[PDB]
Amino acid sequence: RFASVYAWNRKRISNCVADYSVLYNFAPFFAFKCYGVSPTKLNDLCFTN
Amino acid sequence: LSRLDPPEAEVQIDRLITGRLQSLQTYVTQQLIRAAEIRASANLAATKM
């Protein structure tokens, strides 16, 4: 289940290992655009939240 | 360099290079002006001596 564009859902991710490879290697993601970050570099970065 | 990939980071690197080059050019221009001023002052001091 996914929420409507209004009253959209919001989930906070913190204190965990982010394996963006399993996210990029998904087939149905026909559109994948990142701003200020390159998908190939996600696995080497760390964020505050 | 860490966040972006070379293709899209080239524009940002070029922007920063342009900014820093212009800053250094202005700095050296001011330095040349002050050097000419101090050269005139040194000529006056030598004449006075």
Added chain:
Amino acid sequence: LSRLDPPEAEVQIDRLITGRLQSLQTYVTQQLIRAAEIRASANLAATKM
């Protein structure tokens, strides 16, 4: 102007215009400084004459 359409050639020529104008401006500023130096030297030469 050959291997690019005019719309993109506009933003690709912006760089050449600004860079060559900055180069000519730097040259003219250096020549102004040198001309001030030469004017001082010529004034000294006339006084000595």
